[PDB]
Amino acid sequence: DKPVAHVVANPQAEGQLQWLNALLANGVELRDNQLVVPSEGLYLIYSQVLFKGQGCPSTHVLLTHTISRIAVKVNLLSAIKSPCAKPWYEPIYLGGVFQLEKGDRLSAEINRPDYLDFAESGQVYFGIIAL
Amino acid sequence: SSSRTPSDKPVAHVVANPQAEGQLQWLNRRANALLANGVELRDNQLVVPSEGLYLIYSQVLFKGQGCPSTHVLLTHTISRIAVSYQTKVNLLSAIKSPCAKPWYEPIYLGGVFQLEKGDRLSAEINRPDYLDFAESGQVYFGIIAL
Amino acid sequence: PSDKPVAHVVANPQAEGQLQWLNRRANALLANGVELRDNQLVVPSEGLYLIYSQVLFKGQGCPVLLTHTISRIAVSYQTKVNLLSAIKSPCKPWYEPIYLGGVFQLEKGDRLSAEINRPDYLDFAESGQVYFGIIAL
Numbered sequence: 001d002k003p004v005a006h007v008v009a010n011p012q013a014e015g016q017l018q019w020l021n022a023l024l025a026n027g028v029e030l031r032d033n034q035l036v037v038p039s040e041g042l043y044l045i046y047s048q049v050l051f052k053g054q055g056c057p058s059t060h061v062l063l064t065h066t067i068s069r070i071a072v073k074v075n076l077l078s079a080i081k082s083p084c085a086k087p088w089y090e091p092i093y094l095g096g097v098f099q100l101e102k103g104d105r106l107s108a109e110i111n112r113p114d115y116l117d118f119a120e121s122g123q124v125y126f127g128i129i130a131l
Numbered sequence: 132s133s134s135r136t137p138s139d140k141p142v143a144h145v146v147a148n149p150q151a152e153g154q155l156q157w158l159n160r161r162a163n164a165l166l167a168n169g170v171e172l173r174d175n176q177l178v179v180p181s182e183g184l185y186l187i188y189s190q191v192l193f194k195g196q197g198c199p200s201t202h203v204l205l206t207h208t209i210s211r212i213a214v215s216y217q218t219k220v221n222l223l224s225a226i227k228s229p230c231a232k233p234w235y236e237p238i239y240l241g242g243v244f245q246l247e248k249g250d251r252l253s254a255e256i257n258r259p260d261y262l263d264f265a266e267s268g269q270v271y272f273g274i275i276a277l
Numbered sequence: 278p279s280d281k282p283v284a285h286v287v288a289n290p291q292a293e294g295q296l297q298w299l300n301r302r303a304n305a306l307l308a309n310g311v312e313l314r315d316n317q318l319v320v321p322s323e324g325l326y327l328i329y330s331q332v333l334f335k336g337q338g339c340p341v342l343l344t345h346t347i348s349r350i351a352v353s354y355q356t357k358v359n360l361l362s363a364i365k366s367p368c369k370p371w372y373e374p375i376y377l378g379g380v381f382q383l384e385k386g387d388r389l390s391a392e393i394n395r396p397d398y399l400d401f402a403e404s405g406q407v408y409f410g411i412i413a414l
């Protein structure tokens with residue numbers, strides 16, 4: 001009966017990382033692309049995004065992935081990669097334990113959805129589990 | 132500190148001090164950082180209060196501006212020191228060779244381990260001069276009892 | 278004690294030229310039914326699992342395609358189905374860590390393999406660099 005969620009990216013979304021319900025249980029909601037915490041407590045929060053490109057363009061490519069908390073906006077977990085015509089592939093994966101409050105909204109965002117590996121949307125995920 | 136939560140599961144999430152000169156110094160006295168249900172932070176190490184299975188994780192982020200003439204090797208290692216054994220042991224480790232455009236190299240390490248009461252866990256790097264602290268949430272170390 | 282099937286196995290640092298997973302090593306584990314048989318993790322019960330693996334390749338200069346693949350062999354289709362795969366072209370010492378991870382629905386008796394194409398390029402200098410594990414969600 002512990003609040004839990006595991007949401008996955010929509011492969012059909014254009015220019016965005018749209019989360020889809022995968023599961024939501026025991027009060028967790030997915031609203032406006034954010035996971036909504038039903039009760040105060042410790043939660044493991046995790047995510048993985050996958051990027052891919054064909055070669056390197058004229059502008060420097062920096063890929064970011066950040067999990068933030070908005071209490072009723074602060075970065076909890078974040079990382080950046082610089083991958084740069086040969087194909088390249090890079091994952092960014094994050095996780096940690098945090099004390100959350102009722103009604104907190106969690107977001108898992110990237111700066112370059114144009115580089116998402118949409119074909120592997122099943123493994124572009126974001127989830128929480130109450131501990 | 133002695134914080135408690137209803138599940139009584141030992142947990143910790145500590146973060147780097149960005150102004151620590153030439154080192155990776157962990158802190159629990161920060162917003163969105165914590166020690167609960169018996170975990171202690173002593174001499175820069177997490178101290179396990181009870182035996183059991185634990186998830187152990189850490190992330191560091193390195194950044195440089197271009198590539199220098201000397202070879203850059205970046206390492207991040209999580210180690211365990213047991214009381215009965217008194218021997219250091221690497222649990223998780225990675226090495227990266229990133230090489231003027233900025234480069235970024237995160238290192239995330241995570242796994243599941245059987246730990247013993249009184250074990251001390253360390254999370255260390257070889258190049259604190261390449262650590263990046265431009266945003267919160269980039270450098271951290273934690274444990275979660277299952 | 279936790280009842281969730283879990284495993285974290287590590288490469289045998291002295292088995293140079295091979296990728297042999299070990300569960301008896303210090304800081305390697307099998308719990309709650311997971312087995313290590315014929316170099317594969319055996320799933321004890323159906324459910325959602327995180328599967329992960331890190332390998333680390335190293336070379337001294339450039340003479341190379343490096344692959345890392347996690348596959349599933351089901352009792353109902355006893356052939357490798359690739360679940361996660363990566364390929365790198367690394368070409369002074371170079372290092373190439375490869376991480377694979379994902380959440381999958383597994384069945385009782387599934388065998389999971391984590392394999393590379395070039396064990397001659399694996400780095401076995403330090404402990405904790407090469408591992409393969411599962412965690413029942």
Ligand SMILES: CC(C)(O)c1ncc(-c2ccc3nc4n(c3c2)[C@@H](c2ccccc2)CCC4)cn1
Pocket residue numbers: 044046047048093094095096129186187188241242243277281327329378380412413414
């Ligand atoms: C507590 C419970 C219910 O047993 C449970 N354990 C683990 C997960 C889980 C699932 C998917 C994940 N993807 C990642 N992680 C995931 C954790 C993080 C990570 C991996 C391995 C070690 C430590 C951290 C961070 C990297 C990406 C979910 N639920």
